[PDB]
Write an enzyme that holds these catalytic residues in place. Structure first.
Site: not given
Ligand SMILES: [Mg+2]
Ligand SMILES: [Mg+2]
Ligand SMILES: [Mg+2]
Ligand SMILES: [Mg+2]
Lengths: 271, 271
Positions: B50, B162
């Site tokens: 990410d 997330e």
């Molecule tokens: Mg992450």
């Protein structure tokens, strides 16, 4: 008008009934903590008006929950950075609040370790302004550690007179779970604290964030360049000067990011 | 369905065009800079997918601002807690991102000061899980100190896979100024990395928050009890097994507080 929009956004009433605002805000605390299943609250007690007020409301809420047969506690926590100059006022606040538990976490060693590392890694001294925000964020970390360990929610003390100016550290004292003081102006807070029986020394105490090493106990109003009474007039819908309304409408737009979740391209408020 | 509702709320597409997604997200970073008069960005680069993706987007954005005659910079920062086990993958990420500036801040001495103070003050050792959230919040403080010293905004790396589980620390990695990855599923983030020519190691390795001293590099899926393929299928509108919808819809409801500003009595979402 923009004053009406801001008034409405911040939930400010032009007039209040102090006893019923206390009851409503105690009831919000009880409703929220029961809904979530948490064991109670933690809050940093600075000696200042807003945390004295929020702390007493929290203590009243947990006493009411226990009176109903529930399990709730309030942890008040002193969070000095080394020696706090107005420690006596914080101790006076604890005598008034009568919290279930009275804890202390001195943030100086953490803040010094961070500052020393910062200069080691970058070659730059962390400046007083940035270190003050480090202190505020370290207080957030301390309250969330206590809360995580004890199963509690972290109270925040934001209210309308700090909301409208963005006069808090983002993810420092702005980082909290629930807000009992939302919508109150500074003077309305003071009216609640007086109605709860606090002494003048607490409800007329000069507001300070007390974050700077170079200018300890610097008044909020010195930093803002605007008095809380002018802020409060604006927020309650009274007439203020053009200079006051202009300066507060610009600071409100400039700090919208502190009153929203992090911005993404799907948000329209920043455009 | 609640699936469709959560997809809408998290901004997710069943279907994307990877080049357009990159354009849109770079354009958002540039627009937010232009609107706000900001000077660039800071972001923690972990060696995970990410922050690799957000970091490369940030660097493309500041290169495009400067190609257009503006001023912008990007500071990438390594934030190990002492020796990070996958340091090599973080260095690979830096080599791909090619940030304007690559800085480092080792958070260990700050976290150890805090944890030693906590035990001195309370008589309790922080659980490994509570100390891991201290680490995540200390990383937030480090990025905000760099941002504050340098005049930059803090990027966050939250994305839909997330957000739906609430798998971030509240006011830790959740604390950011703007989010280039909003709405992306985990596999969509991989697709964007592939379009940008990332090294495959950075998107084939297991996602990890790596916060625990006793269980280092714990995979997200081990902690969650659900896989990213399942999360992503859900979020992309694909038919999923009832067990997956039950698990995700429960986590999403339980973590709503992480995706709202702090609650007040004037909010109804929580009731
Ligand atoms: Mg992450
Ligand atoms: Mg205050
Ligand atoms: Mg104060
Ligand atoms: Mg990771």
């Amino acid at each position: 008008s923009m004053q009406e929009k801001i008034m409405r956004e911040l939930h400010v009433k032009p007039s209040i009934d102090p006893k019923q605002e206390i009851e409503d805000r105690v009831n919000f605390l009880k409703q929220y903590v029961k809904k979530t299943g948490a064991k109670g609250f933690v809050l940093g007690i600075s000696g200042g008006q807003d945390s004295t007020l929020a702390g007493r409301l929290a203590q009243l809420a947990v006493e009411s929950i226990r009176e109903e047969g529930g399990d709730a506690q309030f942890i008040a926590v002193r969070l000095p950075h080394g020696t706090q100059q107005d420690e006596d006022d914080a101790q006076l606040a604890l005598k008034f609040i009568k919290p279930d538990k009275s804890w202390k976490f001195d943030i100086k060693s953490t803040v010094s370790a961070f500052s020393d590392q910062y200069q080691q890694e970058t070659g730059d001294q962390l400046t007083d302004f940035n270190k003050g925000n480090v202190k505020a964020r370290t207080r957030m970390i301390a309250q969330y550690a206590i809360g995580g360990q004890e199963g509690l929610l972290v109270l925040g003390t934001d209210h309308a007179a700090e909301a409208v100016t963005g006069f808090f550290t983002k993810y420092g004292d702005g980082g909290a779970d629930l807000l009992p003081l939302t919508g109150l102006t500074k003077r309305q807070g003071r009216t609640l604290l007086k109605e709860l029986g606090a002494p003048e020394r607490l409800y007329l105490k000069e507001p300070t964030a007390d974050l700077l090493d170079e200018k300890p106990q610097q008044s909020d109003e010195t930093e803002l360049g605007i008095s809380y009474d002018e802020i409060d007039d604006y927020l309650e819908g009274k007439e203020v000067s053009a200079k006051v309304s202009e300066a507060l409408e610009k600071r409100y737009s400039m700090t919208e990011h502190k009153r929203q979740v992090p911005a993404s391209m799907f948000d329209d408020w920043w455009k």
